[PDB]
Design an enzyme around this catalytic site. Structure first.
Site, PDB file in Angstrom:
ATOM      1  N   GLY A  29       0.815  -1.213   0.000  1.00 50.57           N
ATOM      2  CA  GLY A  29       0.000   0.000   0.000  1.00 50.57           C
ATOM      3  C   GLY A  29       0.845   1.257   0.000  1.00 50.57           C
ATOM      4  O   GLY A  29       2.075   1.176  -0.125  1.00 50.57           O
ATOM      5  N   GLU A  30       0.195   2.436   0.108  1.00 46.66           N
ATOM      6  CA  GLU A  30       0.910   3.715   0.066  1.00 46.66           C
ATOM      7  C   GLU A  30       0.565   4.685   1.208  1.00 46.66           C
ATOM      8  O   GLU A  30       0.908   4.431   2.368  1.00 46.66           O
ATOM      9  CB  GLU A  30       0.740   4.405  -1.301  1.00 46.66           C
ATOM     10  CG  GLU A  30       1.621   3.839  -2.398  1.00 46.66           C
ATOM     11  CD  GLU A  30       1.260   4.323  -3.787  1.00 46.66           C
ATOM     12  OE1 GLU A  30       0.766   3.501  -4.595  1.00 46.66           O
ATOM     13  OE2 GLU A  30       1.456   5.530  -4.061  1.00 46.66           O
ATOM     14  N   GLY A  32       0.221   9.246   1.826  1.00 48.83           N
ATOM     15  CA  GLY A  32       1.066  10.439   1.724  1.00 48.83           C
ATOM     16  C   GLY A  32       2.406  10.344   2.438  1.00 48.83           C
ATOM     17  O   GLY A  32       3.397  10.922   1.971  1.00 48.83           O
ATOM     18  N   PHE A  33       2.440   9.573   3.567  1.00 48.63           N
ATOM     19  CA  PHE A  33       3.607   9.289   4.426  1.00 48.63           C
ATOM     20  C   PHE A  33       4.695   8.420   3.759  1.00 48.63           C
ATOM     21  O   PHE A  33       5.880   8.607   4.049  1.00 48.63           O
ATOM     22  CB  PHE A  33       3.180   8.670   5.771  1.00 48.63           C
ATOM     23  CG  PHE A  33       2.108   7.601   5.692  1.00 48.63           C
ATOM     24  CD1 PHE A  33       2.439   6.279   5.426  1.00 48.63           C
ATOM     25  CD2 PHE A  33       0.770   7.915   5.903  1.00 48.63           C
ATOM     26  CE1 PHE A  33       1.448   5.293   5.348  1.00 48.63           C
ATOM     27  CE2 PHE A  33      -0.221   6.928   5.822  1.00 48.63           C
ATOM     28  CZ  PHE A  33       0.124   5.626   5.539  1.00 48.63           C
ATOM     29  N   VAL A  35       5.405   4.441   1.078  1.00 49.38           N
ATOM     30  CA  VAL A  35       5.037   3.093   0.605  1.00 49.38           C
ATOM     31  C   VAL A  35       5.331   2.017   1.659  1.00 49.38           C
ATOM     32  O   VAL A  35       6.354   2.079   2.340  1.00 49.38           O
ATOM     33  CB  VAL A  35       5.706   2.739  -0.757  1.00 49.38           C
ATOM     34  CG1 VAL A  35       5.072   1.506  -1.394  1.00 49.38           C
ATOM     35  CG2 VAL A  35       5.670   3.920  -1.728  1.00 49.38           C
ATOM     36  N   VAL A  36       4.439   1.028   1.771  1.00 48.21           N
ATOM     37  CA  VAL A  36       4.584  -0.088   2.703  1.00 48.21           C
ATOM     38  C   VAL A  36       4.833  -1.374   1.895  1.00 48.21           C
ATOM     39  O   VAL A  36       4.036  -1.709   1.031  1.00 48.21           O
ATOM     40  CB  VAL A  36       3.382  -0.175   3.682  1.00 48.21           C
ATOM     41  CG1 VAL A  36       3.394  -1.472   4.496  1.00 48.21           C
ATOM     42  CG2 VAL A  36       3.348   1.042   4.604  1.00 48.21           C
ATOM     43  N   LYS A  49       7.529   0.216   6.074  1.00 46.16           N
ATOM     44  CA  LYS A  49       7.010   1.523   5.649  1.00 46.16           C
ATOM     45  C   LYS A  49       8.204   2.399   5.291  1.00 46.16           C
ATOM     46  O   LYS A  49       8.983   2.732   6.183  1.00 46.16           O
ATOM     47  CB  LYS A  49       6.195   2.156   6.798  1.00 46.16           C
ATOM     48  CG  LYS A  49       5.641   3.552   6.550  1.00 46.16           C
ATOM     49  CD  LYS A  49       4.392   3.791   7.410  1.00 46.16           C
ATOM     50  CE  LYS A  49       4.544   4.922   8.406  1.00 46.16           C
ATOM     51  NZ  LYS A  49       3.297   5.160   9.195  1.00 46.16           N
ATOM     52  N   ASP A 139      -6.843   9.894  13.912  1.00 50.64           N
ATOM     53  CA  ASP A 139      -7.109   9.261  12.616  1.00 50.64           C
ATOM     54  C   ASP A 139      -7.677   7.842  12.784  1.00 50.64           C
ATOM     55  O   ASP A 139      -7.216   6.893  12.146  1.00 50.64           O
ATOM     56  CB  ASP A 139      -5.851   9.279  11.704  1.00 50.64           C
ATOM     57  CG  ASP A 139      -6.102   9.281  10.201  1.00 50.64           C
ATOM     58  OD1 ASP A 139      -7.244   9.590   9.783  1.00 50.64           O
ATOM     59  OD2 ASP A 139      -5.149   8.991   9.439  1.00 50.64           O
ATOM     60  N   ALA A 143      -9.452   1.742   7.882  1.00 45.32           N
ATOM     61  CA  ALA A 143      -8.190   1.496   7.191  1.00 45.32           C
ATOM     62  C   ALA A 143      -7.070   1.358   8.218  1.00 45.32           C
ATOM     63  O   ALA A 143      -6.037   0.767   7.934  1.00 45.32           O
ATOM     64  CB  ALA A 143      -7.892   2.659   6.283  1.00 45.32           C
TER      65      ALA A 143
HETATM   66  N1  LIG Z   1      -2.578  -7.957   4.809  1.00 42.95           N
HETATM   67  C1  LIG Z   1      -2.178  -6.717   4.532  1.00 42.95           C
HETATM   68  O1  LIG Z   1      -2.454  -6.155   3.460  1.00 42.95           O
HETATM   69  C2  LIG Z   1      -1.364  -5.995   5.557  1.00 42.95           C
HETATM   70  C3  LIG Z   1      -0.328  -6.647   6.216  1.00 42.95           C
HETATM   71  N2  LIG Z   1       0.468  -6.079   7.125  1.00 42.95           N
HETATM   72  C4  LIG Z   1       0.254  -4.795   7.420  1.00 42.95           C
HETATM   73  N3  LIG Z   1       1.136  -4.262   8.342  1.00 42.95           N
HETATM   74  C5  LIG Z   1       1.218  -2.961   8.882  1.00 42.95           C
HETATM   75  C6  LIG Z   1       1.322  -2.801  10.267  1.00 42.95           C
HETATM   76  C7  LIG Z   1       1.432  -1.537  10.833  1.00 42.95           C
HETATM   77  C8  LIG Z   1       1.436  -0.429   9.995  1.00 42.95           C
HETATM   78  C9  LIG Z   1       1.329  -0.570   8.614  1.00 42.95           C
HETATM   79  C10 LIG Z   1       1.219  -1.837   8.048  1.00 42.95           C
HETATM   80  C11 LIG Z   1       1.364   0.797   8.001  1.00 42.95           C
HETATM   81  C12 LIG Z   1       1.509   1.709   9.194  1.00 42.95           C
HETATM   82  O2  LIG Z   1       1.588   2.937   9.180  1.00 42.95           O
HETATM   83  N4  LIG Z   1       1.541   0.921  10.315  1.00 42.95           N
HETATM   84  C13 LIG Z   1      -0.765  -4.033   6.831  1.00 42.95           C
HETATM   85  C14 LIG Z   1      -1.600  -4.638   5.876  1.00 42.95           C
HETATM   86  N5  LIG Z   1      -2.636  -3.923   5.257  1.00 42.95           N
HETATM   87  C15 LIG Z   1      -2.892  -2.526   5.582  1.00 42.95           C
HETATM   88  C16 LIG Z   1      -1.904  -1.565   4.969  1.00 42.95           C
HETATM   89  C17 LIG Z   1      -1.702  -0.318   5.546  1.00 42.95           C
HETATM   90  C18 LIG Z   1      -0.802   0.581   4.995  1.00 42.95           C
HETATM   91  C19 LIG Z   1      -0.092   0.242   3.860  1.00 42.95           C
HETATM   92  C20 LIG Z   1      -0.283  -0.997   3.277  1.00 42.95           C
HETATM   93  C21 LIG Z   1      -1.183  -1.894   3.828  1.00 42.95           C
END
Ligand SMILES: NC(=O)c1cnc(Nc2ccc3c(c2)CC(=O)N3)cc1NCc1ccccc1
Length: 282
Positions: A29-30, A32-33, A35-36, A49, A139, A143
């Site tokens: 995912g992305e 503004g902060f 890419v993850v 991230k 926030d 999501a």
């Molecule tokens: N199964 C998935 O798609 C998935 C797997 N692991 C994640 N870990 C995760 C944990 C803490 C934080 C973040 C991600 C971003 C942050 O700021 N904290 C997030 C996920 N989706 C939501 C997701 C959220 C943001 C970007 C891409 C995706």
């Protein structure tokens, strides 16, 4: 936590593969902060991230984490302040965001009412802990409620969180979820309760908070449609569930409606929210 070294992160995320997971890539995912990406650090699947104003939200997240460690909050494993970019390494949530699961993104099954009550209860515990430790998320949205292997609610994105009513010029968050006073500049835990109310409405209905091609576009406007006797919450219930009983559905809506009190002081505190949410199931 762990300093990781940019080159280990670059390595384990396949040189930060821009290709999506869907095609065998690493981009999750992305925002503004930044890419993850999906990484693999010593058998462990992680979420890395990679981050307008250049190191703010970084040291903020690092500070809010360490301070905050609860089973209903995402855990930060590390960071990387060297190399070429600022990265953060969290635990990979195999069941993504609540928004994703509510919307059945990528052919997943629709969450049952049973699962939705565990998700609401759990997310409330996370907000409770944050408020107990005098932090305001700023926030709270679906999501930002992540789901592990067992579908436990984990609250994410603490880069905006503030230690606790104070007014500000830099107004941030997600409108559609934002409380009226939050949209004015008021930094208050009461705003977090309002935003949680919108999440409960999303959980009940299965409708996203905002949908440009829908009337009404804002899901919080259905609260008015229900209250103005025009309709009932039973007309909005997510049809993608076989186990949602009207008694507990009405009980969740009752909580959601109390959260969505336009007048900040008329809203229940997170503890009241938790006990009404516990009551609903017990
Ligand atoms: N199964 C998935 O798609 C998935 C797997 N692991 C994640 N870990 C995760 C944990 C803490 C934080 C973040 C991600 C971003 C942050 O700021 N904290 C997030 C996920 N989706 C939501 C997701 C959220 C943001 C970007 C891409 C995706």
């Amino acid at each position: 936590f762990h300093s990781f070294s940019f080159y280990e992160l670059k390595n384990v995320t396949n040189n930060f593969d821009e290709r999506p997971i869907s095609v065998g890539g690493n981009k999750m995912g992305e925002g503004g902060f930044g890419v993850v990406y999906k990484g693999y650090v010593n058998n462990t699947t992680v979420a890395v991230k990679k981050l307008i104003t250049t190191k703010q939200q970084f040291d903020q997240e690092i500070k809010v984490m360490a301070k905050c460690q609860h089973e209903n909050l995402v855990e930060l494993l590390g960071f990387s302040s060297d190399g070429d970019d600022l990265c953060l390494v969290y635990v990979y949530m195999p069941n993504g965001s609540l928004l994703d699961r509510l919307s059945c993104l990528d052919g997943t099954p629709p969450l049952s009412w049973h699962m939705r009550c565990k998700i609401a209860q759990g997310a409330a515990n996370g907000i409770n802990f944050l408020h107990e430790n005098h932090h305001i998320h700023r926030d709270i949205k679906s999501a930002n409620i992540l789901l592990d292997e067992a579908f436990t609610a984990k609250i994410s994105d603490f880069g905006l969180a503030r230690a606790s009513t104070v007014m500000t010029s830099r107004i941030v968050g997600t409108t559609a979820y934002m409380a009226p006073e939050a949209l004015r500049g008021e930094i208050t835990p009461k705003s977090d309760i309002y935003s949680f109310g919108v999440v409960l409405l999303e959980i009940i209905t299965g409708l996203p908070a905002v949908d440009e091609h829908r009337e009404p576009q804002l899901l919080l406007d259905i609260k008015e449609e229900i209250e103005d006797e025009e309709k009932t919450i039973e007309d909005y219930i997510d049809k993608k569930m076989n186990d949602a009983d009207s008694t507990s559905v009405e009980a969740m809506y009752s909580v959601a409606s109390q959260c969505l009190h336009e007048k900040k002081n008329k809203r229940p505190d997170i503890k009241k929210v938790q006990q009404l949410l516990q009551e609903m199931t017990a």
